[PDB]
């Protein structure tokens, strides 16, 4: 069966964190989250491609 | 297209960030990273399941 993730690329782009003393440097976190966002986009695109292919194969077999 | 994935759950665990006098609250960033690590695992399992399912259906169509 299909398994869903918790977050999306847009939710990570738009997440706001509160601040505090000795918090993590914002640019360090944001640059790393940007790499994560691109991975979410890559994962989502490949799943979309694999699920459309899965639907086509199941249709030929029906 | 291809699977040009940049990071792994282990790389996310190992990543360190410099701190500032102020910055993003560490608790909140770390707990968000935990959710992300769990999603990388889910994405992987979903892709593996679809790849093997599609292989099996392709083979059956021709055998
Ligand atoms: Zn499943
Ligand atoms: Zn499946
Ligand atoms: Zn799925
Ligand atoms: Zn930088
Ligand atoms: Zn989509
Ligand atoms: Zn692909
Ligand atoms: Zn270190
Ligand atoms: Zn894999």
Author numbering:
A (entry chain B): -2 to 0, 5 to 63
B (entry chain A): -2 to 0, 5 to 64
Authors' description from the paper:
GpsB has emerged as a major regulator of PG biosynthesis in low G+C Gram-positive bacteria, and its homologues (DivIVA/Wag31/antigen 84) in Actinobacteria play essential roles in hyphal growth and branching. To gain molecular understanding of GpsB function, we report three crystal structures of PBP cytoplasmic mini-domains in complex with GpsB, the first structures of a PG synthase in complex with a cytoplasmic cell cycle regulator. The PG synthase arginine finger pokes into a negatively charged cavity situated between α-helices 1 and 2 of GpsB and is fixed in the same orientation in all structures, just as the phosphoryl group defines the binding orientation of peptides to 14-3-345. Therefore, the role of GpsB in the bacterial cell cycle is that of an adaptor, docking PG synthases to other cell wall enzymes, scaffolds and shape determinants into protein complexes for division (the divisome) and peripheral growth (the elongasome).
Since GpsB in both species interact with class A PG synthases, we next determined whether the rules established above for the BsGpsB:BsPBP1 interaction could be applied directly to LmGpsB:LmPBPA1. Therefore, the K32E variant of the N-terminal domain of BsGpsB is as close a surrogate for the equivalent LmGpsB domain that could be obtained. Of the other GpsB-binding determinants of BsPBP1, LmPBPA1 lacks an analogous BsPBP1Arg11. The sequential equivalent is LmPBPA1Tyr11, but this residue is completely disordered and its mutation to alanine reduced the affinity for BsGpsB1-68Lys32Glu only by 2-fold. LmPBPA11-20Arg8Ala and LmPBPA11-20Arg12Ala mutations reduced the affinity for BsGpsB1-68Lys32Glu by >15- and ~4-fold, respectively, and had significant negative impact on the LmGpsB:LmPBPA1 interaction by BACTH. Reintroducing positive charge into LmPBPA11-20Arg8Ala did not restore wild-type binding affinity in FP as LmPBPA11-20Arg8Ala,Ser16Arg still bound to BsGpsB1-68Lys32Glu with an affinity at least 10-fold weaker than wild-type. It would thus seem that LmPBPA1 represents the only GpsB binding partner that employs the TRxxYR motif in L. monocytogenes.
